[PDB]
């Protein structure tokens, strides 16, 4: 019966923001709207209007004071709403949660409503390097509320209230096609051809769930395979105005399973990505945090079938790599893409931007 509602107050105490949720789920066709309530005393702003803003920003560095190349901030979406005096009726009359909050708080309550667009990226955070004295780049969602005479007026630290929200995605109900790949590497003249096949058992894996790869090698040629090495790679694609791709290995399994010439081989390996042995790796993508709570590896970013542009923010992807090590060269490898997500709960071209792009390309590599 009872439900929880989140609340934050201005430092002066006369301004308060009520939110029904902190994590807003994206359904790949619609995003849960940000509906809330603003409590204020009209005599307090005897003549100032009340505005609330939803902002998503590509950021860098810590939040307070870095003696470094501090935050390159690049807003990806900005919305403005006038809580008091009231705006026209749309979007819609106040919803059930807004109505209940207004009943609870009385006439001193004012609703605000934001509809997050579909193409906005999720909340992810790049892991800071062990040498840097501050957190690394990332994209996050955040909400502000303040009273001012105009939108262009300067900010007021003692008056405004700042609250953080997140955008999350959950695993789709339907299963995907089985990831499998093959590759052949024939020698100079012999019709015999080195051939390996690797495949997964599913296309979607939950966080902490192991991955089974069925490596099948058909080496009918005259050379000997020394080792089979299996790796899981995380692809962090950063798109600001140019596309930069960064690969981070997160799990490796190696066994000395030599293969005799003109003979086959078959094995079913097991591998599991986790954060215990990845805390020193710079450029590792992690899920967004509210304050500083621990978060798992960043969930894969999936795009709808109508992936038209969608290229902003940071996009994460995973791939399993199988590689055969052969004496005197002859390396042959396959890659098996997969998606990693949590199950659904059931209860411009400005100069400084180019400079920062060059700086990030230098730093991450």
């Amino acid at each position: 019966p009872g439900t929880r509602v989140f609340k934050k107050s201005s430092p002066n105490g006369k301004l308060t923001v009520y939110l029904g949720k902190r994590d807003f789920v994206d359904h790949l066709d619609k995003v849960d709207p940000v509906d809330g309530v603003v409590l204020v005393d009209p005599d307090y702003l005897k003549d100032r209007k009340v505005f609330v803003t939803l902002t998503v920003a590509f950021r860098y560095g810590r939040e307070d004071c870095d003696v470094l190349g501090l935050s390159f901030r690049k807003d990806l979406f900005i919305a403005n709403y006038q809580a008091f005096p009231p705006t026209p009726n749309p979007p819609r009359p106040p919803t059930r949660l807004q109505e209940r909050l207004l009943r609870k708080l009385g006439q001193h309550a004012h609703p605000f409503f934001f509809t997050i667009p579909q193409n906005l990226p999720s909340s992810v955070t790049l892991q800071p390097g062990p040498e840097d004295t501050g957190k690394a780049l990332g994209v996050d969602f955040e909400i502000r509320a303040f009273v001012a005479k105009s939108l262009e007026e300067k900010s007021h630290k003692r008056n405004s209230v700042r609250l953080v929200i997140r955008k999350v995605q959950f695993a789709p109900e339907k299963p995907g096609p089985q990831p499998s790949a093959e590759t052949t590497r024939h020698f100079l003249m012999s019709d015999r051809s080195l051939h390996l096949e690797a495949s997964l058992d599913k296309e979607l894996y939950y966080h902490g769930e192991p991955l089974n790869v069925n490596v099948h090698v058909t080496n009918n040629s005259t050379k000997t395979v020394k080792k089979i090495k299996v790796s899981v790679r995380q692809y962090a694609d950063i798109v600001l105005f140019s596309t930069a791709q960064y690969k981070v290995p997160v799990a490796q399994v190696e066994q000395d399973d030599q293969v005799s010439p003109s003979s086959t081989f078959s094995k079913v390996y097991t591998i599991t990505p986790f954060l215990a042995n990845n805390r020193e790796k710079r450029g590792l993508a992690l899920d967004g945090k509210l304050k500083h709570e621990d978060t798992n590896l960043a969930s894969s970013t999936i795009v709808k079938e109508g992936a038209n542009k969608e290229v902003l923010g940071i996009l994460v992807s995973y791939r399993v790599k199988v590689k055969l090590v052969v004496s005197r060269g002859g390396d042959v490898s396959v890659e098996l893409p997969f998606v990693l997500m949590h199950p659904k709960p059931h209860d411009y071209a400005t100069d400084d931007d180019i400079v920062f792009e060059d700086f990030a390309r230098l730093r991450l590599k």
Partner: antibody
């Protein structure tokens, strides 16, 4: 899904006993394994916890330093090493399992092993 | 400091078809992160409630928890002869997790 455990028994005071908890039906990286002891005629008490996904371990202040918890991720088992068993350490030790994403109570329990000192 | 969890009444008697309510006082204002466990004499405990209101799967619907500020209450709508055991109130918002002193429902 079972949390069969073994290793309990009688140990001379100041000695050492090692409890092993062999899980099955789930994985060690999607769950965190906790140890809870029931003092004779007294309510439950938490002693240790291990999170193999993050690599963190926690201990109670009354057993900190004396108790070391570790898990063999390849065998899907957890081990509790007890050093310098005092007089008050006698209880029945339960191996419990809780979901890693996210914690929703100790939904699976072992069956209890009696630890005695004299 | 460690958040002690006070659970009362400690001992009570009931009857089949009666209502039983067990209160649990948190010393610090934790969230709804409170779980309720049942333990029969001789067996291991058993999860009943999590998040202080959500019913665990497989638990009969007669068990129902609630939260009122820091007051967490376990309610049984209609007592059955299977419900005679010891019930524990555990908070898991802050490490270390602390259990209540226990309450036994008796005939």
């Amino acid at each position: 899904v079972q949390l069969v455990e073994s290793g309990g028994g009688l140990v001379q005071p100041g000695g050492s006993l090692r409890l092993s908890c062999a899980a099955s039906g789930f994985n060690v990286y999607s769950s965190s394994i906790h140890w809870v002891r029931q003092a004779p005629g007294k309510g439950l008490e938490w002693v240790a916890s291990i999170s193999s996904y993050y690599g963190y371990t926690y201990y109670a202040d009354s057993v900190k330093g004396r108790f070391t918890i570790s898990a063999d991720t390849s065998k899907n088992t957890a081990y509790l090493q007890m050093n310098s068993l005092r007089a008050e350490d006698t209880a029945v030790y339960y191996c419990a399992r809780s979901r890693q994403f996210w914690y929703s109570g100790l939904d699976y329990w072992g069956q209890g092993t009696l630890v005695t000192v004299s | 400091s460690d958040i002690q969890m006070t659970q009362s009444p400690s001992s009570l008697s009931a009857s089949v078809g009666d209502r039983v309510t067990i209160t649990c006082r948190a010393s610090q204002s934790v969230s709804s992160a409170v779980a309720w466990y049942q333990q029969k004499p001789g067996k291991a405990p058993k999860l009943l409630i999590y998040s202080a209101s959500s019913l665990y799967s497989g638990v009969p619907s007669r068990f129902s928890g609630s939260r009122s500020g820091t007051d967490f209450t376990l309610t049984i709508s209609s007592l059955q002869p299977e419900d005679f055991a010891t019930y524990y109130c555990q908070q898991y918002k802050y490490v270390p997790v602390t259990f209540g002193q226990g309450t036994k429902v008796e005939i």
